[PDB]
């Protein structure tokens, strides 16, 4: 049995809508979650499905993988390519690849491949910044970490599924460009690069996270040690910069997109943690990293309410109203794979 079980059960009890097959945005159960965040809650369901050995929770979560998809398709349709936000398309392409791995349901591989191919085949460009995927498919003014590294990750899942080297080539070309043009080369991931004023070196949890995850995935697909080093350097930056003075990961609210970003960070830190624990690579860092992760999980869960819900401000919420994105990160932290 696990604290991850309790945390995921509580999350579903608080925020899941079995009628609309969608998460509520908050504990008042009034409006459903925003499109892209819903794909990140979809992945938390998947993470908890992989983490749990509770037979009731395992079967519920496996069903819920299908339900989340059906709720979203019922509202937004099956074809997300009319969404101007390439990031929206890619967060759901990545979720769909993972759903295929778990379920074997062909609809998910079609959704993943079709949506990924639309973004990468049409939104990759070498005229601005020597490479990279555009943020939007309407106006082309910026290329962003929050599309490019998720795209590398989606490509890696698609290579794992298909064994089509095209997807390894894509993952590698996207990551290589992103490391060059959206990082300092030393683990700091820049938000975006804009035509007018160039690189915007604002780092955040979710962009550290997708860079770490795509580097770990490239390490596993290629065996090239540089990708594991890239992940370690980005984890070091995260733990010394995106933390309070006590070492607890930051709160990036009140921005609605960022406030839940620890969810995506913790998901990807878990991949690095597992690779280093299992391989005995970077043993000094691995030990420090594991201690810091344990410390963060302990501090988050120390601030659970009586319903076992943890607000995303892990430094301290007594207002009675909890949000599903902000609250997700603590559940993710206890469901790492």
Tokens (6 digits) for 53: 């050995």
In the DSSP assignment, the letter for residue 311 is: -
- The answer to whether 168 touches 159, Cβ cutoff 8 Å, is yes
Indicate the SS3 state at residue 133.
strand
After which residues does a break in the chain occur, C–N more than 2.5 Å?
A: 316
- The answer to whether 219 touches 275, Cβ cutoff 8 Å, is yes
**Structure determined by:** X-ray
Tokens (6 digits) for 282: 């970077």
In the DSSP assignment, the letter for residue 77 is: -
Using CA atoms, how far apart are residues 162 and 180, in angstroms rounded to an integer?
Answer: 28
Using CA atoms, how far apart are residues 68 and 42, in angstroms rounded to an integer?
Answer: 6
- The answer to whether 93 touches 83, Cβ cutoff 8 Å, is no
Using CA atoms, how far apart are residues 208 and 88, in angstroms rounded to an integer?
Answer: 18
Q: What DSSP string describes 256-282?
A: TTTTTTHHHHHHHHHHHHHHHHHH--S
* Count of residues making up the chain: 337
Q: What DSSP string describes 175-203?
A: HHHHHHHHB-SSSPBPSEEETTTEEE---
Indicate the SS3 state at residue 28.
coil
Q: At what angle do helices 324-333 and 35-51 cross, to 10 degrees?
A: 20
Q: What DSSP string describes 278-291?
A: HH--SHHHHHHHHH
What resolution, expressed in A, was reported for this entry?
1.4
The helix or strand, by DSSP H or E, that contains position 324, with its residue range, turns out to be helix 324-333
User: What residue has token string 């074997």?
Assistant: 104
In the DSSP assignment, the letter for residue 335 is: S
Cis peptide before 223 (omega within 30 of 0): no
Every domain of the chain and the residues it spans = 1-337
Sequence-distant (6+) residues with CB within 8 A of 241 are 188, 203
Indicate the SS3 state at residue 123.
helix
């Amino acid at each position: 049995a696990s604290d991850g079980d309790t945390a995921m059960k509580a999350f579903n009890d608080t925020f899941w809508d079995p009628n609309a097959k969608m998460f509520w945005k908050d504990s008042k159960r009034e409006k459903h979650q925003d499109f892209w965040v819903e794909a990140e809650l979809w992945e938390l369901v998947m993470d908890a499905y992989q983490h749990t050995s509770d037979p009731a929770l395992k079967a519920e979560l496996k069903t819920q993988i299908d339900d989340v998809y059906d709720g979203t398709v019922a509202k937004y349709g099956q074809d997300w390519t009319n969404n101007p936000f390439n990031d929206d398309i890619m967060w759901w392409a990545m979720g769909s690849a993972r759903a295929y791995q778990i379920t074997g349901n062909p609809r998910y591989l079609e959704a993943a491949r079709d949506h990924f191919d639309f973004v990468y085949d049409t939104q990759w460009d070498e005229e601005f910044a020597n490479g990279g995927i555009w943020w939007l498919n309407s106006d082309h003014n910026t290329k962003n970490a929050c599309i490019n590294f998720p795209a590398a990750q989606a490509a890696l899942y698609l290579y794992d599924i298909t064994k089509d080297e095209h997807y390894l080539n894509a993952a590698t070309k996207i990551f290589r460009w992103g490391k060059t043009m959206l990082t300092d080369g030393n683990g700091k991931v820049f938000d975006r690069i804009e035509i007018e004023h160039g690189a915007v070196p604002d780092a955040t949890h979710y962009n550290q996270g997708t860079y770490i995850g795509s580097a770990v995935g490239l390490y596993k697909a290629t065996g090239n040690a540089v990708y594991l080093d890239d992940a370690v350097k980005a984890a070091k930056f995260t733990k010394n910069h995106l933390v309070d003075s006590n070492g607890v990961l930051n709160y990036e609210g009140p921005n609605g997109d960022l406030k839940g970003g620890k969810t995506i960070l913790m998901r990807n830190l878990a991949h690095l943690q597992k690779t280093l624990d299992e391989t005995g690579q970077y043993p000094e860092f691995s030990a420090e990293f594991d201690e810091w992760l344990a410390f963060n999980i302990e501090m988050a869960w120390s601030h659970q309410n009586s319903d076992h819900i943890v607000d995303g401000n892990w430094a301290g919420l007594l207002s009675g109203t909890y949000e599903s994105w902000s609250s997700a990160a603590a559940v993710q932290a206890l469901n790492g794979i």
